[PDB]
Design a protein around this ligand. Sequence first.
Ligand code: HEM
Ligand code: HEM
Ligand code: HEM
Ligand code: HEM
Lengths: 451, 451, 454, 454
Amino acid sequence: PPGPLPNTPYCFDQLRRRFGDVFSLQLAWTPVVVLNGLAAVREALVTHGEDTADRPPVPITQILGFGPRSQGVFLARYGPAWREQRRFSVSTLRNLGLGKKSLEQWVTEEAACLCAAFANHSGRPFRPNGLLDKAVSNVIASLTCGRRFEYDDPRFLRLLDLAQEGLKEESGFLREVLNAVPVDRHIPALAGKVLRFQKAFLTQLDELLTEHRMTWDPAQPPRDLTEAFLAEMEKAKGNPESSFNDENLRIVVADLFSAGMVTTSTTLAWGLLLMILHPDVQRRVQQEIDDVIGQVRRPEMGDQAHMPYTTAVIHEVQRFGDIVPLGMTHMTSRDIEVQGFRIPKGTTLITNLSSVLKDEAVWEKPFRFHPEHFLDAQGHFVKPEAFLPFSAGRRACLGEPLARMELFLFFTSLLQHFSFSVPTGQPRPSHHGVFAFLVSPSPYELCAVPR
Amino acid sequence: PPGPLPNTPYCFDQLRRRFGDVFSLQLAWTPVVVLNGLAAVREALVTHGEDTADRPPVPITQILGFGPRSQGVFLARYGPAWREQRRFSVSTLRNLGLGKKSLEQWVTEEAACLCAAFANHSGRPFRPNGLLDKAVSNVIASLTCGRRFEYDDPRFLRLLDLAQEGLKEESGFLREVLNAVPVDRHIPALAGKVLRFQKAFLTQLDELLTEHRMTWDPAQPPRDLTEAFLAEMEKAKGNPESSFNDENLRIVVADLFSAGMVTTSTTLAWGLLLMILHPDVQRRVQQEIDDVIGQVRRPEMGDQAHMPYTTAVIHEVQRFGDIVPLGMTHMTSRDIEVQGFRIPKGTTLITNLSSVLKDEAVWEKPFRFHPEHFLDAQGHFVKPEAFLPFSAGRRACLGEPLARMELFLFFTSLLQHFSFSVPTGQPRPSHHGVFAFLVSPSPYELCAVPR
Amino acid sequence: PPGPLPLPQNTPYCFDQLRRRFGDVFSLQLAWTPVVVLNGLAAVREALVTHGEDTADRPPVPITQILGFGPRSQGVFLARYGPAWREQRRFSVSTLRNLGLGKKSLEQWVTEEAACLCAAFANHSGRPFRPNGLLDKAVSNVIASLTCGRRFEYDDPRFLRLLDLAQEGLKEESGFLREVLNAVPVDRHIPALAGKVLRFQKAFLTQLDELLTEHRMTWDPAQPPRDLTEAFLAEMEKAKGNPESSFNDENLRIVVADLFSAGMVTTSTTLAWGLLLMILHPDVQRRVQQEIDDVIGQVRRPEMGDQAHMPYTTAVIHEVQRFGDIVPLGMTHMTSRDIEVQGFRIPKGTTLITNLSSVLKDEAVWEKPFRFHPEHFLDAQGHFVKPEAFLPFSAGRRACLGEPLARMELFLFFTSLLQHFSFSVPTGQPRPSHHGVFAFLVSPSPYELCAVPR
Amino acid sequence: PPGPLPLPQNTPYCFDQLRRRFGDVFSLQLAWTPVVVLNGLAAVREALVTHGEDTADRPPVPITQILGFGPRSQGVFLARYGPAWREQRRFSVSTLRNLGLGKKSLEQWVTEEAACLCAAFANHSGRPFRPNGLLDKAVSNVIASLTCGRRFEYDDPRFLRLLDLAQEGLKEESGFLREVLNAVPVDRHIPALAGKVLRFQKAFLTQLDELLTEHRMTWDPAQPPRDLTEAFLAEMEKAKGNPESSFNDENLRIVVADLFSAGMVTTSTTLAWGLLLMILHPDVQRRVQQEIDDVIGQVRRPEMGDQAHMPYTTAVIHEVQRFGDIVPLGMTHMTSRDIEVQGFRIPKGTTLITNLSSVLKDEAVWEKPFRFHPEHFLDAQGHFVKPEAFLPFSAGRRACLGEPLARMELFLFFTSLLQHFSFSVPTGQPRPSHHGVFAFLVSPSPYELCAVPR
Ligand code: HEM
Ligand code: HEM
Ligand code: HEM
Ligand code: HEM
C-alpha cells in the first residue's frame, strides 16, 4: 500500500502525483492511508463502506467522559450505539423534512428573519458571518429545542460562543488524529481544563433540553427531534443497553449543533463572497428568481426543481468553496482491498474530498468559479458523480437533506430581497481561504441594498 | 556584537544564556540585535535613546500610502513628523489628564457603564473580553470623537471589528520585520487587498472625525484631542510641511485606537483572570477598597496614593501578564555602543521586554503571580526599575499616564461592585497565554456577583 | 509579476503548487523584496537566453565577503557579472576547448582515470561496496590533472585531505546558499568572527595555494602550457602591466577551487545515480552492454569517438541526468537591469530562481516524467534525439562551464564501467530507493552494489 | 504529574525552560499518552535506582519489529525488560569482567590497539588531519577483539565495509529513536515494505553473521573461551535443551551488533571531544603530559594500574565526558508498573526521558557547568573526586554495560596519545568551536588537528 519512507492539501497533491491515488503515511510506524481518486474514495466508503465506517479514537471522547452508549454520532465508534443513532436521525429528518412542512417552515421563517437582520444594516457595510451563524443555528434549535432564539438573546449568544470555542478546542485534537496512538486508556483528567468550553456547551444544552422535556406532551405525536428522542427513550426503558439515555441525548444534539451550524454557515459565507465577486452571476440568479418565484411570495422547496441556474450556482459554491477538504477521518473495521492494496483492520483513512472536488481530470476548470460545471448544453442542471461535499457511503453527512434545504432557501431568500456588492471604497476581497479542518473565506464585508 | 552562525521568547532565553545579554541574529546577512538585560535595554533606549528611536521600515506604511508628513506615531519614522506628533500627544494627554478632570471624567463614567454592563449578566457566566474592548475603546472615542458610544451601537460594533481585524492584518507584516529588506520602494499595490480592514478602519474614522470637525467651535479652548489637533492645523496652514494635515489626523487617531484599546483591554482580562485564579488576593484588594474608597463614592485617581496593595496588584498583573513581550521593534539612527559592542546605523533592535519583566536575577518569583514583588517589608508599594511594561526612553508608550488611569479606575470600580469567580461546574482556567506579538489569556469565562 | 501575499524546509514539490496556482513566472516575498521563480522551459529560456546578458549576475552572498574576495579576486561561480567574471569565463571555455580536442589531453586524462576507477572497482572482488568514495576520487583526479599536472594515488594522504576539505567546505557554503532565497547582502562588513564559519573552505584554499605553488616551480614559462594552471600563469605574465585584470595569484586558487567543487560533486553524484539505476533496471544494463560489445568491443578502451555510434548508451546517460535531476534549482541568478519575462516587469537587482527540475520533469513535455525512461531520448528508429527541455547544465551566458568535460566524464566512466563489470544489488538485500535526499544537490539514498566481471 | 497543556528537533535548551517553569519532573503530551522527563540528579536517581526495577523497560520501537526480532532474539540495548534481556545483561557483565582483568585480556587488546592508533597518527607526519576516522577504527577494533578474536588492519576492505555498515545503520535507527518521544508501538505488523528502511542495519547484521560464522570454525569447544563470542557459544551448548533461553545464533549476532554500535560511536566521539579540548586548552594538555612523564615515563606503555596514581589525567578525562555530554537524553526508558517519583504517580507503560545533560550540567551542582573545568574533579589537595552528579553512562538496572571497558579505553587511548604526541590547531587555522552538533549523539563540529612528537 505505497507511500514514502524516511499545511497539507497542496502537499498531498504531490504525493498523489508521485505515488498514485491511494498512498500511505507513516509506513514504518502505523500506516495512515490517504484516498485520492473519486475512484479511490468511492471504493473505500461505498463499496467497502460497512468496514470503513469506524472512527479512529480521539482523546475528546475520553475527556468528555463518553463511554458505554453515550457517544454521539460524529465521533461515535462503529457499533450498536452509532447505528442506533444514525438510524434515528435520518428517520427523524425525513419525517420532519417533508411530513407537514415542519423543517421547511422553520427554515423559511428563519430566512425571513435573516432577511430582516440584513435589511437592518441599511446598506451600510458589514460582514455577514455572525448573522449567518445565528440563522443556521436557530434552524437546529428549532429541531432540538422547539424554540428559535432572538438574535440578541444573551442565552443564545452564550450558546453560540460555547459551540464556537468548543469547536476550536476539539480541532486541536482532531488534526493530530492523522498519527499518534488512542490515549493511555485513562487520560490524565488534568486534561479536564482542555475542553472547558465544549463541556460548558454540553451543560447549557443539558438544561435547555431539560426544560424542553417539561414542555413535551408524552401522549402525542413528537413535534421535533428531542421529542422523538424522549419518546424512543420510553420504548427502551427496559433495555439496559440502547443508546436512548439522557446521557446520549445531549451529545447527539451537541453534534448536530456543531456539525450543522458551522458547515452550512461557512458555505453561505462563500456564497455571498462569490456573489459580490462575480456580479455577472448574481444578476443571472436574480433573473431566474424573478421568473420563477417572483417578488411577493417566499421561495419554497418546490421552486428548486424549476431553477436550473440557481441550483447550478449553489453547487458550484459548494465545490469551489470546498470547505471540509479532508472530510472527517475514518478507520477500518476489518481488512480491505482498495485499488489492489491490502488495508489492515484498524487503519486511519483520510478521505481527500478536495482532490475529488478539484479533480483536474474531471472538472473543466477546477480552480475557477464556474457554474457551467453543473449546466448542460441546454442549461439543465446536471450533477457529476465527483460532486461529494458531504462525502459518501455509510458515514456520509446526516444533514445533507437539511443542508440542501438551508442553502437553497437562505441563498435565494437573500438574493431575492437584496443586491450584494463590495463596499464602494474597498479594494475587493480574496478568492482564497484560510485552511483549517474547515476552510472559511478570508474576512470580507459586503453591502446589502434592496432592489 | 555576538550571536550564532549557520517559539521565540523561550527561544531567546537560550541564546542569552549562551551568548550574553546583547546578541545578534543573522550575523552573516544583515544583523538584527536582541537586547536582553534591564541593563542592555536601558543603555540602548535611554542612554542612546535619541539614536535608537527610529522604526524599521514595514510594507504597512507603503501599502496604506503613508509618505511625506502623513504617518502616525506608531510606525512613523524618526524625523520631524514623529517628533511633531509625540510632542502634540504628550502635551494633549497631560492637559486633559488632570487639567479639568477631563480624562478622569471620561474614564470614571466609562467604568460606571462597564459595571452596568457586567451587572446585566446577572451572575450567569460570560467572558469579559468583548466588554473590556468596548469600555477601553470608548475612552479613546471620548478623546478623539467628543462623545462615547452605546455598547450596542452598529457604528461602534463596526469600528471595533474594523480595528481588530486590521490589527490582525498588520501583525503578519510586523513579525516578519525581524529580518528581510524594506520593500522594492514600490510595493505591488495588488498588495492593496492585504490591509482591506485597516484601510476600511481609516475610512470610518475619516468620516467620524469629519463630522466632529463641524461640531467643533474654532473660537474656543479645544475640548478633546481632535479639536486640539484641528486648532494646531489652522495655525500651521502656512507651513507647506508640518504634520498637522487631515491626512495625518486620522492615522494618529487610528494609532491611538489600535495601540490604546487592545493593550489596556488585554491587561484587564489578565487582571480578572488572575483575580478568579487567586481569590486570596481578590479579598485583600476589596478589603483595601472598602477601607479607602468605601461603598458609596466612585473610586478616583486620588485614592491610588492611599492604596498600596491594589497598586502592587495592578503592577503584578502587568508584570506576570507580560503582554507585549518583545515590545515594538526599533532601529538605529546612527552607530552606537551597547555593552561594548558596535551597532551600525540602520539596525533592527529587538527589545526583549519579557526578559526584563521575568528577569531571574531581579524578581523573587519571576514565573509566579506574586504582588509582594511590589510591596516592601511594611507593605508600602515600591516599583523596581525592572518594571518596564511600557518600555523606556524616547519611544516609550505615549499612553502610559492614561493607561495607569484606566487600569486603576476600571479594575477597582469592578472589584468594588463585584466578586468574580470561576463558574461552578468549570475546571478552572490556565495561567498560560497564547503567544502573538500580543499575549492574551486563553479564553476563560467568569461570574460577576455583587457583594 | 504574480505570487502570494501574506497574513501568515524542502521546496520543489512546493513550487509545483505555486506554478499551478500562479502560472510559470511567479514572485516570492512580493511585499518585501521580490524573488522570482522561473518555471517553464519557456520561462527559463526567455530569462537566461533571450535576456541572458542582463540576468547573468550573481546575488550577493556572505561567502565572497567571508573568504575576503573583493576586487578582481572572485572565481567564476560566485563572481559578480563584470569584467572579472567575463575575463575568466572566456579563459576557461578557451582552455577547456583547446585541451578537450587539441591533442587528446583531456580525453587522455579521463580515459586513464577510468582505467584506474575500473581497477579500484575490480579490487573489491565482487564483495559489495558503495561506489561513492571511488566515484569522488576519480572525478576529482580529472580536475587535479587539469589544474595540478599530475593525478593522485587513491590512498595518498594529501589527496584524501583535499577531498575532505572540498566536501566539508561545500557543506559549509550550502548553508549560506539556500538562505540566498531571501535576506539582504551583508552589512558590507561581516563580523569576521564569521571567520570560524568557512574554516574548511578556507583550509581548502590554503592547500590548493600550495599544490599550485609547487606547480609553478615545475612550469616551463618558455613552452606551450600543458594544463589549465599553466595557461593561467602564462596569461598572468601577459597582464603583468594591467593593474586590473583578473589574472592574479589571488584569483588563480579561487578559480581552481571553483572548478574542484562545481566539478567533482556534480559529475560524481550523477555517476552514482547512473550505477543505482543500472542495478535498479538490469533490463537497460544488458542493452547498454549489448551496444558496448557491438561498438567498442572487449579489447580497446572506449573513446569519445564511439559516442556518435552509440545511440542507446547516449540515450541512457541523458535519461540518468534527467531522472537524477541533481541540481533542481540550478544556481541562483540576479538581474543586471530590468527585464520582462512573460509580460512581467522584473526590476534591476532581483533574485531569479531557475527551476531546472520543473523543466526536466515538465509534465507537458516528457511522456513519463517521473519514470526512468531512456525512450525520452530515442526516436522511432532508435536514433538518439535530445529535446530542448534537456537542461541539466542550465542555459545562457551563465550555463555550466564544465559541460564539455562532464559529457566526456559521464560517457567515458560510465561505459568503461559497464564494459568491464556487471552491477547488481547484493544478494540478501531488499533493493534500494529511486527517491533521493534533497539538498541544493540531490544524491541517491545510500546503496551498495556488487561489481562482477563478465 | 505536571507539564503543559495545549490548543496549538533542538530539545535540551528547550527542556531547561519547562524544568524552570514546572520543576524537575514534568509531563509531555499530558492529554494523549504522557511522556515524562526526569530532570534532577535527584529525579533521575529516584527513578532509575530507587525504582530501577520497574523502570528498566524499553519503549517499543519499529526497529525491533522491522529487524524481525521477536521471541528472545533481541539484543540488550532495545531488548524489553524480561527473561531475554536479564539473561544477556548477565552474560555480558560476567564476560566483560572475566576478560577485564582475569588475564589482562581486555587490557592487552586495548593497549596494543593504542599502539596502532599511535602509529596511525604518527603516519600523518604532523601534516593536519581530523582524527575521527582513526578514532572509529581503533575503538571498533577493541570490540572486534572481544567478538571476533581478530583485530583488523585499518586498510582492510572488510573492516572498512563493517564500519560503513555500522555507521549508516545507526544513522537509520536514530530516525526511529527520536520519534520515540511520542507515537504508538506499531500496528503489531509493520508494512515490511518498511524493509528498505534499515537496509544498512540489516546488511550490517549479515556481515557479522558471517564474520562470527567463521569464528565458530576457529573455536575450540573443549577449552576455556578466549573472547565473548566463544563464551556465548559455550553457553549455547549448555542451553541446547531449553526451548527458551536467549542463547541462539539468532541472538548472538544482535548482541554483537549492539556491542558494536553502542560501543564504538560513544567511545570514539568522547576521544574526539578529548582531543578537541586538548588543542583548545593547551594549558591543560601540558599538565596532563607533566603527569604522564612523572608517572609512566617515556619508555613503557601506559597501563591501567597507572590510573590510580594519576589524579589530574583522571580529572581531565572525566571533565571531557561531562563537558562533552555526548548522549544528552541517554536512552529512553519505560515503566514496568506504576511508580511514584517526587510525589507523582507514573502509570505502568510510560516513556521516561532521562535528561542526563541536566544532571551533568546541573547549575546547582557544578562550580562552572558550561565551562571546561577539570577542577570539578579535583579537591583542595588535587586528589581526584567524583561527584554523584557524574552520570554520563547513566544509572540503575539499565546503566551502560560498557562502562568498565569504556573507562579503560578512555584512559589508555587518551594517555597513550598524549604521551607520544603534542596536539595543536593547524598553524593557519582560526581555531575550532567548543559547541557541538546536537543529534541523539553530540559530536564536536569537524576540526582538524596536528600531532607532533615531543
Ligand atoms: C453544507 C452544510 C454541510 C456540509 C458541507 C457537511 C459535510 C459533512 C461531511 C463531509 C461529513 C463527514 C462524513 C464522513 O465522515 O465521511 C459530515 C458528517 C456529519 N454531519 Fe454534515 N455537513 C453539512 C451540514 C450538516 C448539518 C446541517 C448537519 C445537522 C443539522 C450535519 C450533521 C452531520 C453529522 C451528525 C455527521 C456525522 C456523521 C456520522 O458520524 O454518522 N451536517 N458532514
Ligand atoms: C497597559 C496598556 C499599555 C501598554 C502595556 C502599552 C505598551 C506600549 C509599548 C511596549 C510600546 C512600545 C514603545 C517602544 O517602541 O519601545 C507602546 C507604544 C505606544 N503606545 Fe502604548 N501601551 C499601553 C496603552 C496605551 C494607550 C492607552 C495608548 C493611547 C491611548 C497607547 C499608545 C501608544 C502609542 C501611540 C505608541 C507608539 C509610541 C511612538 O511610536 O512614539 N498605549 N505602548
Ligand atoms: C553532470 C556534471 C555537472 C552538472 C550537472 C553541472 C551543472 C551546472 C549548473 C546547473 C550550473 C549553474 C549555471 C547557472 O548559473 O545557471 C553550473 C555552473 C558551473 N559549472 Fe557545472 N555541472 C557539472 C559539471 C561541471 C564540472 C565537471 C565543471 C568543471 C570541471 C563545472 C564547472 C562549472 C562552473 C565553473 C560553473 C559556474 C558558471 C559561471 O558562473 O560562469 N561543472 N554547472
Ligand atoms: C564513553 C563511552 C560510552 C558511553 C558514554 C556510554 C553511554 C551509555 C548510555 C548513556 C547508555 C544508556 C543506559 C540507559 O538506558 O539508561 C548506554 C547503554 C549501553 N551501553 Fe554504553 N556507553 C559507552 C560505551 C559503551 C561501550 C564501549 C559498550 C560495549 C563495548 C557499551 C554498551 C552498552 C550497551 C549494550 C547498553 C544497553 C544497556 C542495556 O540495555 O541493558 N557502551 N551506554
